[PDB]
Amino acid sequence: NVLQIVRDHWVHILVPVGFVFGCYLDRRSDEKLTAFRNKSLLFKRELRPNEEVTWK
Amino acid sequence: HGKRLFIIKPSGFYDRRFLKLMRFYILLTGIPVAIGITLVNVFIGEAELADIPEGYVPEHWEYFKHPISR
Amino acid sequence: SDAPPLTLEAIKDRVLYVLKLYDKIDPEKLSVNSHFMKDLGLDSLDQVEIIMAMEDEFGFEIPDIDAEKLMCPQEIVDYIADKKDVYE
Amino acid sequence: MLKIIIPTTMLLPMTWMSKHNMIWINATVHSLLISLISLSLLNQLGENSLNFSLTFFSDSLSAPLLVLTTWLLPLMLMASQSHLSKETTTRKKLYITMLILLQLFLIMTFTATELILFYILFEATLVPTLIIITRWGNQTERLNAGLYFLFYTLAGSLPLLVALVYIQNTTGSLNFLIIHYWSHPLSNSWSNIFMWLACIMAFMVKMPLYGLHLWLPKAHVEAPIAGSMVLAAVLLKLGGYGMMRITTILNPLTNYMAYPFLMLSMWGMIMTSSICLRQTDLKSLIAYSSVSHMALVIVAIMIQTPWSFMGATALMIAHGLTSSMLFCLANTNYERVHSRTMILARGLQTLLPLMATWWLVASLTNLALPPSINLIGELFIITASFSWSNITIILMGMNMMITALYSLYMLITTQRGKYTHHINNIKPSFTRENALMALHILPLLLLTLNPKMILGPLY
Amino acid sequence: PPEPTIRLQEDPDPEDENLYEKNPDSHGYDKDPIVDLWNMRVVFFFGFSIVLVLGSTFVAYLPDYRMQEWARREAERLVKYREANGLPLMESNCFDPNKIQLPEDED
Amino acid sequence: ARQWQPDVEWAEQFGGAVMYPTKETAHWKPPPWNDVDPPK
Amino acid sequence: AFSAPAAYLTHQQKVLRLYKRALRHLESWCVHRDKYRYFACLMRARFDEHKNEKDMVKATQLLRQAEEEFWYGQHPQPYIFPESPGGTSYERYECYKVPEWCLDDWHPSEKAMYPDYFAKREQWKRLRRESWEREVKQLQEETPPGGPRTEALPPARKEGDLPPLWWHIVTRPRERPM
Numbered sequence: 001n002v003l004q005i006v007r008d009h010w011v012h013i014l015v016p017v018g019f020v021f022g023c024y025l026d027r028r029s030d031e032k033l034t035a036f037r038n039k040s041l042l043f044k045r046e047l048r049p050n051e052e053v054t055w056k
Numbered sequence: 057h058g059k060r061l062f063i064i065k066p067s068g069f070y071d072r073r074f075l076k077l078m079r080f081y082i083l084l085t086g087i088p089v090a091i092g093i094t095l096v097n098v099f100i101g102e103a104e105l106a107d108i109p110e111g112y113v114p115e116h117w118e119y120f121k122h123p124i125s126r
Numbered sequence: 127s128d129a130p131p132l133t134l135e136a137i138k139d140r141v142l143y144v145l146k147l148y149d150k151i152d153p154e155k156l157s158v159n160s161h162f163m164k165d166l167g168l169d170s171l172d173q174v175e176i177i178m179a180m181e182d183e184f185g186f187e188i189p190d191i192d193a194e195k196l197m198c199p200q201e202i203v204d205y206i207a208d209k210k211d212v213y214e
Numbered sequence: 215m216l217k218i219i220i221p222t223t224m225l226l227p228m229t230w231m232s233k234h235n236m237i238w239i240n241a242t243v244h245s246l247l248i249s250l251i252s253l254s255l256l257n258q259l260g261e262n263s264l265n266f267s268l269t270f271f272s273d274s275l276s277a278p279l280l281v282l283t284t285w286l287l288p289l290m291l292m293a294s295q296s297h298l299s300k301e302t303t304t305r306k307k308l309y310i311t312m313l314i315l316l317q318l319f320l321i322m323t324f325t326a327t328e329l330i331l332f333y334i335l336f337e338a339t340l341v342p343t344l345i346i347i348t349r350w351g352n353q354t355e356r357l358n359a360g361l362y363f364l365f366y367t368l369a370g371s372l373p374l375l376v377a378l379v380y381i382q383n384t385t386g387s388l389n390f391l392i393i394h395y396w397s398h399p400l401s402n403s404w405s406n407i408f409m410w411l412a413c414i415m416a417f418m419v420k421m422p423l424y425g426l427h428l429w430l431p432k433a434h435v436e437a438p439i440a441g442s443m444v445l446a447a448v449l450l451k452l453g454g455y456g457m458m459r460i461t462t463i464l465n466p467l468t469n470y471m472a473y474p475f476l477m478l479s480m481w482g483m484i485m486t487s488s489i490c491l492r493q494t495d496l497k498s499l500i501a502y503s504s505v506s507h508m509a510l511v512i513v514a515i516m517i518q519t520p521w522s523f524m525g526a527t528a529l530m531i532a533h534g535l536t537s538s539m540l541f542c543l544a545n546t547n548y549e550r551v552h553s554r555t556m557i558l559a560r561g562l563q564t565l566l567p568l569m570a571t572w573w574l575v576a577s578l579t580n581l582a583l584p585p586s587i588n589l590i591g592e593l594f595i596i597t598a599s600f601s602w603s604n605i606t607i608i609l610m611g612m613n614m615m616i617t618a619l620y621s622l623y624m625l626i627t628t629q630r631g632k633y634t635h636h637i638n639n640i641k642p643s644f645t646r647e648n649a650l651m652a653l654h655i656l657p658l659l660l661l662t663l664n665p666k667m668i669l670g671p672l673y
Numbered sequence: 674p675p676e677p678t679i680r681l682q683e684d685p686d687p688e689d690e691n692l693y694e695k696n697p698d699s700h701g702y703d704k705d706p707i708v709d710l711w712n713m714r715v716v717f718f719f720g721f722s723i724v725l726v727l728g729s730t731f732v733a734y735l736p737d738y739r740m741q742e743w744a745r746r747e748a749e750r751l752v753k754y755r756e757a758n759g760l761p762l763m764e765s766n767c768f769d770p771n772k773i774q775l776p777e778d779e780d
Numbered sequence: 781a782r783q784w785q786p787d788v789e790w791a792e793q794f795g796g797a798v799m800y801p802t803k804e805t806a807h808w809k810p811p812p813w814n815d816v817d818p819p820k
Numbered sequence: 821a822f823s824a825p826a827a828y829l830t831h832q833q834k835v836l837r838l839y840k841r842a843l844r845h846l847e848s849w850c851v852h853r854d855k856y857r858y859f860a861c862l863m864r865a866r867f868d869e870h871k872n873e874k875d876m877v878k879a880t881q882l883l884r885q886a887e888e889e890f891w892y893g894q895h896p897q898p899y900i901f902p903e904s905p906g907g908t909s910y911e912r913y914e915c916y917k918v919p920e921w922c923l924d925d926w927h928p929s930e931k932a933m934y935p936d937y938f939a940k941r942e943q944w945k946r947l948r949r950e951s952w953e954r955e956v957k958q959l960q961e962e963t964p965p966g967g968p969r970t971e972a973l974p975p976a977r978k979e980g981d982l983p984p985l986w987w988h989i990v991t992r993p994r995e996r997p998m
């Protein structure tokens with residue numbers, strides 16, 4: 001029953017939340033390593049007309 | 057001849073129960089997987105190698121052949 | 127296998143058969159409860175020979191410790207029945 | 215890499231905020247889900263690595279070890295559920311906390327782009343294991359065992375730290391990528407010889423090396439089942455992983471300096487396999503078998519050829535799984551008979567046939583029956599050694615023969631023959647034990663279908 | 674010697690308790706039948722069904738990031754080119770010698 | 781069936797004035813429970 | 821097998837055991853029955869010529885030369901009955917022998933089959949429970965002080981008593997359980 005099993009099963013939601021937070025933090029840390037994006041000699045690519053960044 | 061005797065042996069109930077449970081769960085997930093895999097191969101098919109058209113840059117997942125891998 | 131489930135009657139008959147084929151004993155005076163040493167006047171060498179005959183006729187070996195104290199046909203039959211687990 | 219680290223951390227508040235009778239269920243379910251998530255690290259590259267950030271990076275040597283570490287926790291929980299029944303909720307939560315902390319430290323250790331960070335976590339794993347051994351062990355020797363398991367380790371690890379900081383004072387960095395790209399030869403000097411020794415001995419003691427293996431039988435015998443599982447499966451592989459990482463700065467001095475360790479390992483595998491033939495304790499026999507397998511891994515790492523490294527990776531994974539299964543079987547027998555003496559409970563095939571099948575398959579994988587990954591690693595190492603020197607074949611074949619001998623001796627003594635008459639408390643095997651055994655053994659026979667997942671970065 | 678031979682006040686060693694005694698169909702997980710059954714169910718579903726089957730299928734169908742077929746195709750076209758032009762297949766030098774400056778010995 | 785825990789004999793190892801008793805230090809005595817000596 | 825062993829073997833027992841062993845090994849040597857009968861009668865005669873010796877030292881000097889001669893000519897591959905400790909089917913059916921207490925671990929669905937058997941088993945268990953309390957006292961009162969000297973057990977003395985320590989002799993699995 002709602003508002004009753006929540007008080008007994010609230011703990012279960014924590015691990016899944018951590019997985020999402022870790023994914024978000026991984027992307028945020030990825031955003032700080034773009035000093036060479038579209039600058040490597042191997043993947044110097046000219047941007048598409050409706051493109052901002054080659055990868056995110 | 058009604059000389060049937062009782063055979064003393066350990067309980068086979070728990071071994072059979074465990075085997076049935078393991079088989080049931082493995083099949084519970086594997087049968088849909090097998091059917092889906094076969095269906096995907098049969099109708100979706102597999103990508104065929106082709107030359108990259110001029111002025112077109114493919115996505116990173118367009119360099120792979122199997123649809124599930126893509 | 128197909129070996130018949132031998133009974134006490136068969137064991138008794140076969141033991142008495144082997145004993146009546148021992149010519150140092152007269153068969154008419156032989157009985158299931160007759161003692162070997164006194165009722166028939168046999169030596170202990172004769173007793174061990176009788177044990178060997180029983181072993182060769184039933185296809186299994188009686189150990190020396192058990193064999194050396196089997197002095198009547200009835201108790202020989204009982205020993206064989208206990209070893210082979212005969213019901214009736 | 216945080217998408218695996220954060221859920222493992224969240225395992226702790228979830229464990230401590232759980233009901234008194236839901237801790238095992240929640241821990242098992244969420245540890246299994248973490249294992250499933252970590253399974254996606256196996257998509258490795260033919261190029262450098264999976265460099266997530268400045269702190270953590272993944273490699274096809276690190277990924278199998280990470281996946282095995284994540285997979286071991288649910289099995290450890292299932293094994294620990296039985297003998298912790300009569301104990302308070304707070305203490306069971308503390309035990310699960312120790313297991314979770316061990317997993318977290320191992321996960322961060324295997325990625326650990328920095329060598330000092332690797333050392334810190336590689337030594338942080340020491341504390342949970344020591345607490346588990348000296349708190350939830352049964353016999354009175356556990357304390358002594360803990361002391362050994364402590365000091366040996368530190369006796370090897372303290373010089374390494376000095377060496378490490380020394381390197382950064384000369385090179386300027388301890389990042390593994392920079393070290394690999396800027397590596398330079400080591401001149402044959404006394405100072406370089408002692409730097410080599412300081413770099414090697416810390417990982418040698420935890421393999422363990424044959425002369426330095428005294429702590430392992432004690433620590434594995436006196437530890438509880440979860441402790442033995444984690445010690446044999448993951449903690450022994452830290453030395454191999456560290457050697458594989460650190461031998462990049464030790465060339466060409468490894469050519470000369472490898473000889474005493476090569477001789478020690480090649481003779482000690484024979485010695486420990488022979489010791490297994492005369493053993494009155496199941497756990498001690500399994501521990502000595504672990505010593506033999508790790509001696510083979512030491513030989514492989516010291517030869518430092520591609521086939522050597524592939525065989526060593528495969529053998530590390532296979533040995534972890536097989537030794538965990540063997541310890542679990544021994545513990546299933548022990549929880550019934552409470553003796554841990556191999557000769558006492560006999561003829562268990564007639565009473566526990568499915569457990570006898572599990573015993574047979576575990577002995578077969580320990581025996582390195584093809585095409586198991588145990589034999590894949592064995593054969594790759596043996597071929598590399600043969601190329602190194604053709605005379606190694608005598609020692610390798612003798613080790614194979616003795617290994618088969620003691621594995622089948624262990625199987626025949628416990629499962630075959632006649633049951634002990636006075637023992638009448640051998641209950642039918644529980645579904646938990648059979649599930650544990652299957653969850654050990656199916657990954658092995660299923661990994662033999664895709665060997666490149668466990669053959670390392672030189673595949 | 675009026676000593677009791679009782680060195681201290683100690684509880685007797687308890688006898689081990691059978692889970693099958695109070696509960697057949699006990700699964701060996703817990704003495705509570707409901708928690709026992711649900712522990713068995715979650716272990717079997719999340720171990721055999723989810724991780725073991727779906728994870729194995731996921732590993733089986735992992736995309737070729739190791740570039741095995743890519744290397745095979747590159748080698749195929751390279752061998753086709755060199756065989757057509759009569760070039761001696763693989764060269765013994767990994768780098769071009771013209772762009773390496775050796776140190777003159779003058780010994 | 782039960783985990784071993786220290787008994788009285790195990791505890792008495794740590795009850796002396798010092799650890800590792802010697803012939804010279806055998807006659808030493810542990811200090812009083814409260815750090816007070818009789819004035820005699 | 822069944823009978824309790826003694827502290828020693830007397831001279832007569834040693835002679836009889838040598839007689840049986842020599843006859844069996846001569847049978848191994850003499851394959852055919854007529855040849856065996858002839859040589860066995862000769863062998864019995866050769867035993868009989870010193871049946872009446874009164875000197876124990878002479879009789880002990882004998883049987884010793886005899887056992888030495890036996891060991892010299894003992895047919896290193898004698899015939900063994902298949903079920904005997906050296907036979908080819910000695911412990912063949914031990915893997916089929918299951919203890920009776922294992923039935924206590926059967927699931928109730930397993931005991932639902934064979935209800936009469938388990939009712940009779942319950943009767944046997946009750947009989948054992950009472951008889952054991954009687955047996956302990958009877959053995960304690962009948963044993964000589966200082967402990968038993970020979971591992972021979974007494975029978976039941978009263979009407980309702982059962983032989984002491986009978987459960988594991990009466991409830992043997994079978995010679996061929998399966």
Ligand SMILES: CCCCCCCCCCCCCCCCC[C@@H](O)O[C@H](CO[C@H](O)CCCCCCCCCCCCCCC)COP(=O)(O)OCC[N+](C)(C)C
Nearest residue numbers: 122278281282285657660661663664725728729732733734
């Ligand atoms: C009970 C009696 C038997 C009844 C059942 C009968 C049926 C038996 C059939 C099953 C066994 C027979 C062997 C036949 C194998 C067929 C499937 C196989 O061919 O697929 C494999 C695929 O499977 C995978 O390679 C192996 C599975 C990976 C295992 C991962 C472990 C699961 C995670 C658990 C935790 C980890 C613990 C251990 C840590 C290291 C290899 O395929 P591969 O040619 O290569 O490429 C796949 C397809 N491509 C081409 C599209 C890419």
Ligand SMILES: CCCCCCCCCCCCCCCCC[C@@H](O)O[C@H](CO[C@H](O)CCCCCCCCCCCCCCC)COP(=O)(O)OCC[N+](C)(C)C
Nearest residue numbers: 402403404405407411415423424425426470471474475478
């Ligand atoms: C106990 C359980 C196992 C623990 C671990 C055991 C492994 C440790 C083994 C150490 C590896 C080798 C150490 C030194 C190797 C150097 C090569 C040497 O053996 O050969 C000769 C070395 O000569 C003599 O060895 C000189 C040193 C003599 C003093 C050493 C003590 C001998 C026994 C000590 C062993 C005790 C080990 C444990 C210590 C606690 C060659 O002489 P030379 O070509 O001119 O000089 C070569 C070195 N240079 C080039 C840098 C100058």
Ligand SMILES: CCCCCCCC/C=C\CCCCCCCC(=O)O[C@H](COC(=O)CCCCCCC/C=C/CCCCCCCC)COP(=O)(O)OCCN
Nearest residue numbers: 366369370373376377380405406408409411412415419426
């Ligand atoms: C399981 C228990 C094992 C215990 C530890 C075993 C490993 C022993 C390895 C040596 C320990 C310390 C080594 C130093 C760490 C590396 C630092 C380094 O390489 O710097 C060297 C310094 O080299 C040293 O100082 C080494 C001195 C060692 C003193 C301690 C000796 C310990 C015992 C020696 C005998 C045993 C050696 C091997 C034992 C293996 C383990 C059994 C050169 O630097 P500089 O001198 O500044 O530059 C040269 C120009 N001046």
Ligand SMILES: CCCCCCCCCCCC(=O)SCCNC(=O)CCNC(=O)[C@H](O)C(C)(C)COP(=O)(O)O
Nearest residue numbers: 169170171832835842846867870871879882883886890
């Ligand atoms: C082919 C293989 C090798 C064969 C070689 C072996 C050679 C053996 C021949 C040696 C000769 C002997 O008898 S060795 C001589 C041993 N000493 C005696 O015989 C003294 C008194 N005899 C007994 O006591 C007997 O038991 C007896 C009274 C017969 C029965 O007794 P029962 O009334 O209690 O049945």
